[PDB]
Amino acid sequence: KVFERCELARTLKRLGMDGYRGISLANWMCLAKWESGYNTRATNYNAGDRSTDYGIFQINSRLWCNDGKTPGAVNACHLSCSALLQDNIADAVACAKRVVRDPQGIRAWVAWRNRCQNRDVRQYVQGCGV
Ligand SMILES: *[C@@H]1O[C@H](CO)[C@@H](O[C@@H]2O[C@H](CO)[C@@H](O)[C@H](O)[C@H]2NC(C)=O)[C@H](O)[C@H]1NC(C)=O
């Protein structure tokens, strides 16, 4: 499912993501835009370290979720990577919360550092109601 912009916004707010660990809603909207283009079935495989990135928040299969086929997996989110491909983002949102609680917080999302850090990211929540 490819969420629509505000559709996603209301959803994440409803899910307690706004201001979570100080992180604004638009910031979560910025990283989602650049990580998955709001598509829950988005997956990207790194042939070098041999792990995959699943869904909307593109969560890595070596550290957080489990697909069974990834070398040296930790499964910190205690989830199956299939739970990160559901049209329902409730499971992806809780794990994403787990990621930000580790030492480096939101710096864990590359696209967030490359396209949102120190930028105005308000346009992602404008007209959304939130
Ligand atoms: C993206 O992959 C990087 C590694 O390429 C992950 O970063 C590691 O994350 C854990 C926990 O946050 C740290 O102990 C490591 O030191 C991190 N490595 C680096 C180089 O930062 C990162 O968590 C992954 N992000 C997602 C969303 O899956």
UniProtKB/Swiss-Prot annotation:
It catalyses: Hydrolysis of (1->4)-beta-linkages between N-acetylmuramic acid and N-acetyl-D-glucosamine residues in a peptidoglycan and between N-acetyl-D-glucosamine residues in chitodextrins. Residues 1-130 form the C-type lysozyme domain. Its EC number is 3.2.1.17. Monomer. It is linked to Amyloidosis, hereditary systemic 5: A form of hereditary systemic amyloidosis, a disorder characterized by amyloid deposition in multiple tissues resulting in a wide clinical spectrum. AMYLD5 primarily affects the viscera, and the predominant clinical features are renal dysfunction of varying severity, and intra-abdominal bleeding. Inheritance is autosomal dominant. Disulfide bonds join C6-C128, C30-C116, C65-C81, C77-C95. GO terms for molecular function: identical protein binding; lysozyme activity. GO terms for biological process: antimicrobial humoral response; defense response to bacterium; defense response to Gram-negative bacterium; defense response to Gram-positive bacterium; inflammatory response; killing of cells of another organism. Pfam families: Lys. Belongs to the glycosyl hydrolase 22 family. Its main location: secreted. The lineage of its organism: Eukaryota, Metazoa, Chordata, Craniata, Vertebrata. This is Lysozyme C. Keywords: Amyloid, Amyloidosis, Antimicrobial, Bacteriolytic enzyme, Disease variant, Disulfide bond, Glycosidase, Hydrolase, Secreted, Signal. It is found in: Secreted. It is an enzyme of class 3 (hydrolase). It comes from Homo sapiens (Human). PANTHER family: LYSOZYME C. PROSITE patterns: GLYCOSYL_HYDROL_F22_1 (PS00128), GLYCOSYL_HYDROL_F22_2 (PS51348). Lysozyme C is capable of both hydrolysis and transglycosylation; it also shows a slight esterase activity. It acts rapidly on both peptide-substituted and unsubstituted peptidoglycan, and slowly on chitin oligosaccharides. GO terms for cellular component: azurophil granule lumen; extracellular exosome; extracellular region; extracellular space; specific granule lumen; tertiary granule lumen. The gene is LYZ. The active site is at E35, D53. CDD domains: LYZ_C. Lysozymes have primarily a bacteriolytic function; those in tissues and body fluids are associated with the monocyte-macrophage system and enhance the activity of immunoagents.
